[PDB]
Paper text:
The human aldehyde dehydrogenase (ALDH) superfamily comprises 19 enzyme isoforms catalyzing the NAD(P)-dependent irreversible oxidation of aldehydes to their corresponding carboxylic acids. Cytosolic ALDH1A enzymes, and specifically the ALDH1A3 isoform, are good markers of cancer stem cells and have been implicated in carcinogenesis, chemoresistance and relapse. As previously observed in other members of the enzyme superfamily, each ALDH1A3 subunit is composed of three structural domains: a catalytic domain, a cofactor-binding domain and an oligomerization domain. At the intersection of the substrate- and cofactor-binding pockets sits a strictly conserved cysteine residue (Cys302, ALDH2 numbering), which is essential for catalysis, acting as the active-site nucleophile.
The ALDH1A3-ATP structure at 1.78-Å resolution contains one ATP molecule in each subunit. The ATP molecule in monomers A and B is located in the adenosine-binding moiety of the cofactor-binding pocket and is accommodated via direct hydrogen bonding with Thr178, Trp180, Lys204, Glu207, and Ser258, and via hydrophobic interactions with ten additional residues (right). The α- and β-phosphate groups of ATP have identical interactions to those of the NAD+ pyrophosphate, including four water molecules, while the γ-phosphate group is not showing any specific interaction. As anticipated, the average B-factor increased from α- to γ-phosphate groups of ATP (66–72 Å2), being highest for the latter, indicating more flexibility at this end of the ATP molecule. The ALDH1A3-ATP structure also contains two PEG molecules (PEG1 and PEG2) inside the substrate-binding pocket in monomers A and B. However, in this case, the PEG1 molecule is covalently bound to Cy314 in both subunits with a distance between Sγ-Cys314 and C1-PEG1 atoms of 1.82 and 1.83 Å for monomers A and B, respectively, which is a typical distance for a covalent C − S bond. The O1-PEG1 atom is hydrogen bonded to the N-Cys314 and Nδ2-Asn181 atoms in both monomers and occupies the position of the water molecule near Cys314 in the ALDH1A3-NAD+ structure. The genuine interest of the ALDH1A3-ATP structure is that it can be interpreted as a true thioacyl-enzyme intermediate in the ALDH catalytic mechanism, which is trapped in a dead enzyme lacking an active cofactor. The role of Asn181 in stabilizing the reaction intermediate through hydrogen bonding with the O atom of the carbonyl substrate, as suggested by our results, is consistent with similar bonds observed in other ALDH ternary complexes. At physiological concentrations, ATP inhibits the dehydrogenase activity of ALDH1A3 and other isoforms, with a Ki value of 0.48 mM for ALDH1A3, showing a mixed inhibition type against NAD+.
Author numbering:
A (entry chain B), B (entry chain A), C (entry chain B), D (entry chain A): 20 to 508
Write the structure that this text describes.
């Protein structure tokens, strides 16, 4: 196991433009606080519209025809991404420590999950660089028709506080592999790993202006990016409400392309013939992973009547044994919630459960009267009309609903405006495939949960998003199709 | 040559929902007028939000799991699209006549261009129905991962007045081949071919509710479609201003997927080494086709200084010899403009060209005093700052500009916020490919103009659009990607 | 049900070259006899090397640059195949009757299985004609690299007696859709449907020389095709021994490309958790379909010990009720075997079973002392070392073997030099996917048998063949890849 | 520039099986000689059929289900290929020196051409490992159909003496990225780089038996590989005569899949409108690269009559100035021929050119009386009937032929039984694309020569080969397609 870095000094705190560090144009700065201790970590330069303008102009110059970035052969863009992955691997412990300090997630989770995801995603897209292929299309005997899959141009990337570096890398890896330039805006709560990544981008050898990073607030920096007349594409991960604002501003300004990865009301369907211990363990990790602060979180655990009582019993047992505490301690599986507004929202939803008729099986309150920790909570006798079964909790709360038939559970699982993920637990071939086909979700897991691969696309149906991240499908978000039609005389 | 149907009676004027004809819920009707005779053709039912709600509910019921449309095998949807193409070919004369009546385009142009495009597009996408393939993705030894390219659901289609049936078919053909259901809104100026197509959809055997058609106005029917919470995707063709409103309405409502095909400020570049007579004939058809009312119309004809004078001279001969008159006459190459608003807009721009310093080479005024016909107009000595060079004329006006170097003409051609099409005329291999690569346009034609194929994608860069129509690329706009990841125990 | 044509006169009996009918160069003729009655049907022209030379020269002329076939646009080759499918549909009863007379298979099987397969295959490949796309490959900033998927040229097609027309159409549909020309050789036992198809090819409008048909014997016509210096590709379906000779002659002569579809020793694995009645019915159809004369025939039925005795009992019941008799009679499910050498081989293998220790559960002898009919036979207590479990019977004999574990049955099923098809019967998700992954077979059916689709590739692993027929994969057998690399100055 | 290793000691001379070094079962050894010094370099173990049987059994054990190689995830095979590329780059100087010692090619050519190709090919295919994707195919509402692109199994690789390491890497890179295991046979003249690569395969961490190397002769080791019943695929590069023997042996034995990369009679067409100096430099490197010992060598330089005399004149200057000598010297562009047999064959053809009427413009004899060096030779007035135009010289002889029209030169260029490469020099767009389409060659270069990319497929039409090497196309040669069709109950 890697040794934790409990007292790490943050070195990178400025705006990154043209491979140089800059103070904000206004001189303003903002603080980032450690959610575990509640103390201030450091001050970071606070960007605004003039800093975004400078970042966009640097990205435009780096993207113009004839530039060192545009002239690189396809395989050299791949080599640059591999070198970046090598540096992320070399500085893996430092990056994980910065993520633990900023988010409160356990150091070993940031090391083995977030950083592993970053490295695998960078290596995967490094391999696509010389494999982005268009088509030659048969038309007429005297015509030569083909398509080019060109880079779009300047890509904005706006990311959230729950998986800061990973959500950034999910955008940067396909964007750079396709030949685009970028302006990145990490969440104001979590700017540290993004700024450290900027130092690795320069050391890896990327030409200046290819990647630019402007820390700051959503309505200031984020809105300057979404409305920018010279940004050609935006990729956003965060709340559905902010995703709607970003896409509206993009449409109002220059019709820039927009990919959105938003929330979900994700179901977890446990059939009577499931491997019950596997279903209990996966639905537990599904609800409680990252303190329940994950877009993939299970928010509705539907269990067939035949195994309902036993499933609740084993779930209550798992929830009570989960070690909650200091993220740097090796034993910890659950750190604190990110902030007060998030924490208070969870407790208000927990209170709503008892009042509406759900049976509080365990937890249901804070761990201590000072910290941001909530005790792993489980509710049984949950019905569809309840608040704990309709609203995204984003916390450690497991609502367990009962069902009788497959046709019934398909209708109930799909009765939401969302569709990010779904999970099915059954040993039966036909039920597994029938449910995988019928569930309106971007990812359907069978007999597993949170099984992500850099080669498998991820994204939402309905209000859970537009477009896909990961896999070959990610390339379509970062390229523009040009048809060239030549008529021979 | 097919005989012109100069006195065709209109049979279909109602709202089409569940394969039945309905009056508008309000009882209101609007008139459609013939731009050649300036007389009313008929009254069509005027839809509003209640009619759109009824059409959407029919489309949702036809898309629900277990419906006859959803249970058809892949090859059977192809058979349906092929039968629809056979009916369009059988009724080709009636449809071309209805299109000439509504738009003023020559009958032979509607017959051999619009209708040929319709038939070819339907047959091409009929062939894709059993060829929409997802992927099997290698992950780990104990994992089976694959993608399904599922239909999106209810698709809205909002089309313009210049190529009414063709723009509708460009959306209907891939939508139905992918298994979606639809709500169509033809332009208020041109509803007749859309309603006749509804009668053919029923005759072809499409289950009720698979295609629904609601004639009416933009802020009423169109806005109800763009904002509907049960429409999952919208495809729009029309102006950049309205495309922005449609996309903002989509974002604000349910984040429905949006394809936009908008205007352009399309360059036509003629090099000194070009086959001059070929370039003259192509740039002439490129400006004057469909009375200049084309999204692909060349808005700036850039001609190299060495051949400028001769290009201008031959272009004037073509414009002066272009036959303008009754669209039902075999000799007619240019009919009237769509309406008085369009006609006055074109004359205002012609007047503006004279006032800003361009040399009026021919035309420059209306053909008569009581019609909507405009004399084919050519302007030389045009500069980039002029209104006739900066604005989309959407009329029979050819602005001819002069250039000296390739690098200069690339900068000038790309200086726009648009990027729909571009055309290049040169005999030099390196020059043709360098321009094909450097021009920021969705389609680049070389030694041809308006060369479209059902198998070649079409769409814009920048503010000319989002997404593609035609080719294999159209399928991505009408399907939603689902990852299924199975962990073997 | 279609009315049978018991006394149909065969109209087409000559060599088909350049859309004209010719007598053989030698004047020689051969007879085709009805295997049901044992009487002569008619005489057919007997081709040899000079008739193959004339057919190849006609195919070469039809393939040369500038020819009417080479100049057709991609979509028109698709239209021609659709018209051919329409004619095959129009003359479906006549074609099925010719196939029943030649092969002895029931009229309703030829009508609803063989002819349905022909029509679906022609329609499917008609849709690929304008969708055969190469690639544009990113290399260097100053390079334009792309691939063309060109037709190969003259394609020979050699087919067997068990599914005469279907095996021919599996080759002709992708060959013509890709733009190739052809020389067809049907089996000497079954030339009638191929010659009738020649009349439909001319009526459909294919240019002369695009398809040429030379009936005759294997060592004469077949060997002239396989060794021909001007045939560029051969596709063969038949025995492994003859497939080896064809590929050797192809390599010795001009290295012409060769696709082979050969025999198999196909296993059918029934797990204890299977739907037993479904497994019994599918393994019954799997063994006894087309009188056991099918490359897909189940030759080893492995049944798990827990359900072994019950599976044997229900199988014996199904075998005893199968109606054997006149192919034109509506009730008949099993006609006669094709010929004496085939029939005697079956009886010799049946005799070997009793002698080696297998338990003859039912049948085991001829139906009558005059005809070519064999009684549906089932053997239990079959072991791997036995002749009935190692050699391809090509008859109505069901060897039932017992197994205890999945790992054991994988090893035993894969212990053959063949690998055409496999079938698995289980309700368990994990076993179904583990077996589908581990079985070395070109097609793995789960809970079904003989489930073929024009869109799903079919072909063998190991000595069961080289290449694939059907699906998008079929196009790779009928195209040659050309890389065009252009360096810009 | 890298320092030449003029006295490198050979470390690896043994048979490589299961990551260990073995003596030949017979104890026999054969000598490898340096063509520059004409002295023995060392003795290498001489394999035979027993060594091939041992290597095949090791490869089969390493490919068996559950082996460490088979259980590695897709991305881990990519990591292994990348590590192998890093070791080849680290030992680049040693490998280039070993290649110069065995072949006589200049050290800098081996370093910047052969070794660069090796590294680029390994890195390209390392990127394909987790991107080999099958398809999900739409069939019926109750069917789940998909394809898997499985590894074929044990792959044999038989390579020639002209580009020893590069031809081996062209097979190894896609074979291993697809998950296959291998048995390699380098040419008897050039075994040293293959055995050094074996030491790097072990160092990189490939499990034992994944790559096995057996040096030896063709009719002994090569024939044992081509006829082996447990080798599932063979890839061969070399002469057309031997490729035929290999393919016939494959057919006769177990129908193992065969890729062939054979000789060519490659045309180089220079039009009157070409950049003459570019065409002279390209056709010179195209004939003289690697002492003329290239499968891509231009065998007929067709020059348009209008520029014929000037082309001949400038070509002679290039040939007379080409530095011939010690390959370890920085200035050397042409080393010795491979052996006495090759050297005498070239001189016999040079003598034949003089006797048949060609004008000897320069060279025409050996450089000295004791070496294997030949003076760069140019012949003008060459006609199609001559031996120097009809036969593959495989030496430094440039035959320059004259042509008048495009149609004439297309007929003459395609009159061969071969079709590996073609090159065209013209500034005209239509001429370049018409020739690219009409020339029957696997690769058509336009305004360049020998422009190869790891991402661009390479192979022949007609008797120049079967299948492709490089690009995505190479994956199809190293995978076997499996259709899995699941019927839901
Ligand atoms: N108006 C905006 N325009 C653009 N970006 C914004 C805007 N508002 C927020 N963002 C940015 O979007 C990203 C995601 O923020 P997010 O939607 O998750 O808000 P949140 O505070 O985390 O959620 P919540 O308010 O539901 O608790 C961050 O980088 C944030 O700064
Ligand atoms: N030597 C040959 N060369 C080429 N084609 C041949 C040759 N021998 C047979 N054929 C042809 O190949 C096709 C398939 O014949 P096939 O291999 O099935 O022989 P068969 O008589 O049916 O089998 P079996 O001898 O095992 O009972 C037929 O069209 C046949 O005429």
């Amino acid at each position: 196991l890697p040794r934790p870095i409990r007292n790490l000094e943050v070195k990178f705190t400025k705006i990154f433009i043209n491979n140089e560090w800059h103070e904000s144009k206004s001189g303003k700065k903002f603080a980032t606080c450690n959610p575990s201790t509640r103390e201030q970590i450091c001050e970071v330069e606070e960007g605004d519209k003039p800093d975004v303008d400078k970042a966009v102009e640097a990205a435009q110059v780096a993207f113009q025809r004839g530039s060192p970035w545009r002239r690189l052969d396809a395989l050299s863009r791949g080599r640059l991404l591999h070198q970046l992955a090598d540096l992320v691997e070399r500085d893996r412990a430092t990056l994980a420590a910065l993520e633990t300090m900023d988010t409160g997630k356990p150091f070993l989770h940031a090391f083995f999950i977030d950083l592993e995801g970053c490295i695998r995603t960078l290596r995967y897209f490094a391999g696509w660089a010389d494999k982005i292929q268009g088509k030659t299309i048969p038309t007429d005997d005297n015509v030569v028709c083909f398509t080019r899959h060109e880079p779009i141009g300047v890509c904005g990337a706006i990311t959230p506080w729950n998986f800061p570096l990973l959500m950034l890398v999910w955008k940067l890896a396909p964007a750079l592999c396709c030949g685009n330039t970028m302006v990145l805006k990490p969440a104001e709560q979590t700017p540290l790993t993004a700024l450290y990544l900027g130092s690795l981008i320069k050391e890896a050898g990327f030409p200046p202006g290819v990647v630019n990073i402007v820390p700051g607030f959503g309505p200031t920096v984020g809105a300057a990016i979404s409305s920018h007349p010279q940004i050609n594409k935006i990729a956003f991960t965060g709340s559905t409400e902010v995703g709607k604002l970003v896409k509206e501003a993009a449409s109002r300004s220059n019709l820039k392309r927009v990919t959105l990865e938003l929330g979900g009301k994700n179901p977890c369907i446990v059939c009577a013939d499931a491997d019950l211990d596997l279903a209990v363990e996966c639905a537990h990790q599904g609800v409680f992973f990252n303190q329940g602060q994950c877009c993939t979180a299970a928010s509705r655990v539907f269990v067939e009547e035949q195994v309902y009582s036993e499933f609740v019993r084993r779930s209550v047992e798992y929830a009570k044994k989960r070690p909650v505490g200091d993220p740097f301690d090796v034993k910890t599986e659950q750190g604190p919630q990110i902030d007060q507004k998030q924490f208070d929202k969870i407790l208000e939803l927990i209170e709503s459960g008892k009042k509406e008729g759900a049976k509080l099986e365990c937890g249901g309150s804070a761990m201590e009267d000072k910290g941001l920790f909530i005790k792993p909570t489980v509710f049984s006798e949950v019905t569809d009309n309840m608040r704990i079964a309709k609203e995204e909790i984003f916390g450690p709360v497991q609502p367990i609903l009962k069902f009788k038939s497959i046709e019934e559970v398909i209708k109930r699982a799909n009765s939401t405006d969302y569709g990010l993920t779904a999970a099915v637990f059954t040993k039966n071939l036909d039920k597994a495939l029938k449910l995988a086909s019928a569930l309106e979700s971007g990812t359907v897991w069978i007999n597993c949960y949170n099984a992500l691969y850099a080669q498998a696309p991820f994204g939402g149906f309905k209000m859970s998003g537009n477009g896909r991240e990961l896999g070959e499908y990610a390339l379509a978000e970062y390229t523009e199709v040009k048809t060239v039609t030549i008529k021979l005389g």
